[model samples]
Target: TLEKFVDALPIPDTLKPVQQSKEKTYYEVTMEECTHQLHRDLPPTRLWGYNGLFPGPTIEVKRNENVYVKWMNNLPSTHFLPIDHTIHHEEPEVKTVVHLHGGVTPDDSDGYPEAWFSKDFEQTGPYFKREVYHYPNQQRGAILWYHDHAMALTRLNVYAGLVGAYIIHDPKEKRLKLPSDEYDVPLLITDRTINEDGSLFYPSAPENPSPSLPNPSIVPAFCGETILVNGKVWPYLEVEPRKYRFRVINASNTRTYNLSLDNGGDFIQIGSDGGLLPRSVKLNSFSLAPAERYDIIIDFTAYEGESIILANSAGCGGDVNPETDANIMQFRVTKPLAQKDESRKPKYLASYPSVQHERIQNIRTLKLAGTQDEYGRPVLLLNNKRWHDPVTETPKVGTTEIWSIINPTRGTHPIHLHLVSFRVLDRRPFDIARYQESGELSYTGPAVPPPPSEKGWKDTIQAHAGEVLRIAATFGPYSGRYVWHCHILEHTDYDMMRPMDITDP
Candidate 1:
């Protein structure tokens, strides 16, 4: 049965330190059901980890440091993925929690979907307690992540593998000297489904297998095909000619890459998903939705003894579907240059404060749209609302606005933006049926500029399909409500999501 579930499995680590000076830090995260034999004929069937892998570990903190963590779960009462109590679950026995997505933290540690917890002491969430979580790292350096945000089983507990990768670091990025330790690495990436005795499969239903299935216990949503990286699938890494620093992270559920590098090489971005970027952005191939994040820089010194292949580039804006593009991994450069590779130079890097178009005021304008009901389960909308409705879009705190997302939803929705950080004022190409017949907007082309690592400051933004993007933020410190979705966690838990507030000018 999947090689006896990957032969029982093991390998998982978690360090996360590096808070450095300001004091007040404490960390502890647990969430069990380990096992991880990934390949070699599989044999470790359990899954759902946080301290045991499937994308856990990698916390690294800095800017204002005040972390605290403490999330323990211990696994085992049931739930290896496939739960849908009609969506919005937590505390129904096989529960779990932890969410630090873009960390501005506070809302009882922000994993709020009722806070969940279960296992070991039997029962938890009402915003659980001793489970720690206090991250006051006050923003700035970005690339945040941490999953299993419970509620309706957060897409089967982050697809039975949970998730991880946090990273804040700042002192203006340590005087900008990038790429450190084994040349700074944190690829994370994700996507799975192996079974044939290779373990790791997760298809509770939808693969076109109905058989009079009323709700044959519904739970199936994405299916996956295989494309790991940190959790290794096509894994390979041997570069030594120099310049590395990747930090990618897509953690797919819907997949959308475009990543390229067959030997063409030259990705240079330099921070995003809310972090440094006022410079470096060399592109040879980019796109990366689904929980997006990218902090690029790749050199491999002129391909010594060559071997690149990372590919995935097919019909990007046409919404990726050429049989899902190919390649995925392979990097062989095998050392050689023992000296000449200087350390950092994307023109020096670090820059942050923009968005002052006369201080801005307010200009909103969402609109992503796509629908289906009577049990079709594919609805995605935004300005066409449906995240339960109640607070439309507040924004006051420190002022400065200008939202404008707009994609006519065919595919590319990365969009994030929780706890501010924006810039990327252009993507233009409207008129998808004149704005879906009526909402008025008609253009024929001509506005694309927004890529120099998207100019500076960003909290995720990809929004393609008939484009229109625009951004320009500012909603200071610790505001009231918060949420801006589509980091594509299955179209943000099947609804495309929405919610924003800041108030108290």
Candidate 2:
């Protein structure tokens, strides 16, 4: 096994826009196949990266800036990863589409699953609209990200390395005196398994595969053997004896991470996926599902000269191995102070969720269910419908709705809605057997309101098994076709996603 913490964490450079102005800011990114060493002992691993960098470049933008990105694809026509053709019959097997995880973008720029493009834009998907996508960043400052959203290829493409961070900074938040500039770092966590020779090891199919199944059938879930922060495997970072802000993003394929500092320090959480939290919540640890973003600050003043590990308690496949997957990265408080710590972790971070509540225009109950394919492979579904089913979730613009997600599946699904952020209302446990047998909802426990950490606006939420998670959201500003789906790339590619229409009428 590769030695842990032998490499320093690689911080992705902020992308410089190709052109910039007060009226408009434009940037261009290309998806290219490249190679990079993931660990100290490993050879350069082949990867499909944005601008030839794994975990691509961190993009920073102003809150109200009109940003445009011409995301170009310049990769090879054939894919290196094994493709499961039986899943979906889209041509030009190698395809890519960029989705801004938390951006308030229009329909065309929302990266609809079918809006894919081939190498050099030679071939495009059915929903492919424009080459230059526009992002009117008119929302609150938050930690956003971009990743491949190709239809059935999303799972393979993203696993091959296609992700980046995009942060929208609000000038108004500057007065809050939170960590600024270099002190605020983006920690993108991705779990991966690497071969002895340093090639990425993504399974073509589950072990002991049925003879009747296709050769490259998709697996139900994947948990990499190693943890990576930014782009390096089991990396380390040296921090000064001061407060530092970390925008932690869970970019894993299916693994959920319960993160904590090995030193038993506190994490002052200041934001969730949607943006800044209403109030900072101090916690010893917090669970982060795939695609969830946690904005937090760790003060290391008292632990000078000590090395602490950013560890994980959650496991993939089975339990987390203490010697390997449990350790995310090492933080050595060894850097000398450039200046005194000036950042402040304020108690009040943002407005409470109650202030944004509106009259409910509709309430919809959805189910997380699955069925088996002809080959006995599992196919997860949302509301028992395929991706091409008639759009049944059309909500008029300028309206509020409550979505009650009833998950009967065995695993938790991080349900993500595009375009707008929502507030978590509560989660209540129910009798799964009763619901499945008689189609009756029977409460097995009391309804519990979301904790303070989840009280803020969120674009993604974890819907645990045997529970009904309720969230309220308002659809407005700009309305068009978007999507809401499970953020688990494996389940998502197998058809756990659906089109969400927001009619402008």
Candidate 3:
């Protein structure tokens, strides 16, 4: 029997810095193994987490603040999850490195995939350079997240529970009066499969593996049997009849969620992955891909004493089951008024992207294709190059460029870029068969502008199949070695990522 909304949604505590001064703030987050119950009826499940807390403590900082984090790993030498030795072939399979998604940081602090370290910092990867990661929050306020990015092990490590919320609060946006104090919340969504004994279950091998395939094979995708919000399975939150701001993040491995309120209420999208939009958008439903974020405000003034369910329409491997996978969480608005909703959902939010006709320094067309490995497993690639291939995407500092990403695959991939935010130009469908057969570009339809929810700055964008998605970004403020890749963790580990270098001219 499956359970629904049997527990209260947990709000992760705000992590207080270990040392703080006018110039810098320092924090120490150790990755440790711990046990916590995901549901009310199940026994405690063993897992790995940051600071011994699943869905780790929320780290909040002010805009332009100098922050440093000592992301230490303190788990046992052996990994509990199945590690595909064929992928890494490294000794002591347990390794970790933290990457702050959507952070405008320097190269050394950007959490390169090869920069991984083992327990007590004794064993380190080839690219391990710094013991403490630095974050000079120079960008606008955004909903940034930190997760494991170790090479060849990111998929397993993140699934083992090394993810948390990192919010950058700009003082300028606070004046907008969206929501604050207890009214503001962070909803980190994770999907997982569990065993009858309350143990975490990850696929050891792909279904119907060929005899030539290795003992442990990497699966192309993963869709969990259950949905969790902030570490609780099918949880519920009680809110006062007012306005609340939720930083909704899709932390799943491969599943994408089409989210909507069951009662047909609208979600006022105030911000996105990068920051506030040029103007607010009223969205009845939105599709959230892995690693994407949507900062929204939901007013409960009219729905007092009502229990509204947050519903999901997207499916995993197959169609979503109405009883188990269709429900996300519940919102019970039964509390009394909380000091009269002082927050204002203003229409004018932030400045729009720069002038449209700004000179473009470069225009590059990239492809998303893949080949089969020796074992007949899919190995995804970017521009047909592996992760270790020669660096091809080099942008000069202080230059604006337009990236036309061609997706010939059969599914949508959330493409993410580090160290900068960009604007979505448009998407146009093409003849996939013609492009694949003759290497020719043929448009199937006219270009369509992005929806209002995608008009603002974004660090991650969904590129659907047979569509050429175009984006423009100005690479500046720092020059270093960063990365751009597909956000699907499973495909990412098998090699869908590539290094992006920003050269100082």
Candidate 4:
């Protein structure tokens, strides 16, 4: 009896404190678990969240302004999901480390994976220390998000729900005259399964069912029957037959969404994961990988009074069908033509200072490798390397680098680069079989430019199989050890991540 939550949930507004000091503004956030209605049909389900809200509250900031946040954890001693104490670096303590993804944040406040602590500071991890973190908001406008990044338990913590949107705006974006407030929305899309008892369902380990947890023995990934948008279960919202800007984030565990409208119409994408796009790119359907965000605009006046359901056509977990995994949420067009729309989609949205190939300082080849373990479970990895491997991807603080990613596997990995955004140079088909046997990299097709939808600033990209994916980026205003990994939370927990250390001058 699972159904949509009656009232549609909107974008979480900022927690920008009204009270401010001369130096910097401050706010406090707490992580707690409570019972709430995911859907009207299901019973109140207990899930972890920030300040009791499932998707957590949105935090908005201005460019160049400094904000300090004291992230406090208030969860119980035990975890609700099955803990894979064997995978990653086993951290049994229920600690919380908040990471503000995509912010031009300082290294100390960037939520190091090991910097997490438990109740009353009774027990702390190796890298745990600071209670409050600083955000300079030095970058451009971005639809970032904050979530629990504790070392081994990130998968468990995010599954139990520890995520929210982070938006940093600027005067330049404001002058664009795009839709604001109610019209400019944020959509955090996630998937989850519910048991007959109305409890949150997730598979802990890949191989077999542990006697300690009641979840079924699942394989490499996890997917749910129900889809949630902005923390509401398959909910619908009424719109005023006009152009509405939707900032969409794929916050799912393993699901990759090829999103489209039910009735018909393309998505006018104006932004990518890191920030706004160079210009408007129209796509029949756009694919969103986990943790990647897109700022898009949809005009509803064409189909006035018609109800449109956001459908997911992309095979989530490699199984995409209209019958089973479609019908995400509803968008009902209401009201008449409300005056002449004047918002513009200019040829240019943002200009990258530079990620030129001529300026490439280092060219590195990384591989997305995988092999099944004794449990017949896939152990996906980066260049067949472990987390403790010698730090290999060390970029100088201020320089550009081109990475040639050779993926021999079959699935497309949504490769994410932390602390920086990149542009896809090209993705050419490769002779994966030859490389498998002969150990020589060969190309199958001519080097081609990325699709129009992908020719923009992106922090996470779909590194396809049987291809040599090329990307370029200028590594930074801040120098420190950050991580680059697959955003598919399960794989991320199982060694598919590597430390990217940026050296200082």
Q: Which is the leading candidate under TM-score?
A: 2
Model 4 agreement with the true structure over 1-505: per-residue lDDT tens digits: 3554365765566676645776798888888988877777777889998887878888877888789988888899898787665564443459788999887777778887777877555677776657888898888788899898888778779888899988888878877878777778889888988887779988655445545532333346778778888776888888888888888988888888889987768888888877887778887788888888989988886778888889988776556655446867888887555566666655577764343434779999998986666555667889888877898889999898999988888888899888888888898898888999987998888988888767778888998879888999889889987888988888887778888899997
Cα lDDT computed for each candidate against the true fold:
0.70, 0.93, 0.92, 0.80
* Candidate RMSDs in order: 22.7, 0.8, 1.0, 2.7
TM-score of each: 0.33, 0.99, 0.99, 0.93
Model 4 / residue 228 / CA error / Å: 0.6
Query: Model 2 TM-score?
Result: 0.99
Candidate 3 clashes between residue pairs 3 or more apart in a chain or in different chains:
none
Instruction: Return the clash pairs for model 2, or none.
Output: none
Predicted candidate 3 versus true structure: per-residue lDDT over 1-505, tens digit per residue? 4489889999999999999999999999999999999999999999899999989999999999999999999998888888887765445678899999999998888999988899988999888899999999999999999999999989899999999999999999878998898899999999999899999999988877779878777889998898999998999999999999999999999989999999999999999898999999999999999999999999998999999999999988889888988989999998777597889999999988754566899998999998888787889999999999999999998899999999989999999999999999999999999999997989999999999999999999999999999999999789989999999999899889999999996
Give the lowest summed-lDDT range of ten residues in model 4: 210-219
- Judge candidate 1 at residue 11 and give its lDDT: 20
What's the CA error at residue 381 for candidate 3, in Å? Answer: 0.5
Q: Tens-digit lDDT track for model 2 on 1-505?
A: 7788999999999999999999999999999999999998999999999999999999999999999999999998888888998988647878899999998999999899889999888899999999998999999999999999999988899999999999999999999999888799999999999998899999988998889989888988999998999999999999999999999999999999999999899999999998999889999999999999999999998999999999999878888899999999999999999998989999988889898658899999999997889998889999999998899999889999999999988899999999999999999999999999998999998999999989999999999999999999999678889999999999999989999999977
In model 3, how large is the Cα lDDT of residue 143? 97
Let me know the TM-score candidate 4 reaches against the reference structure.
0.93
By TM-score, is 2 or 4 better? 2
**Predicted structure with the largest lDDT when compared to the true one:** 2
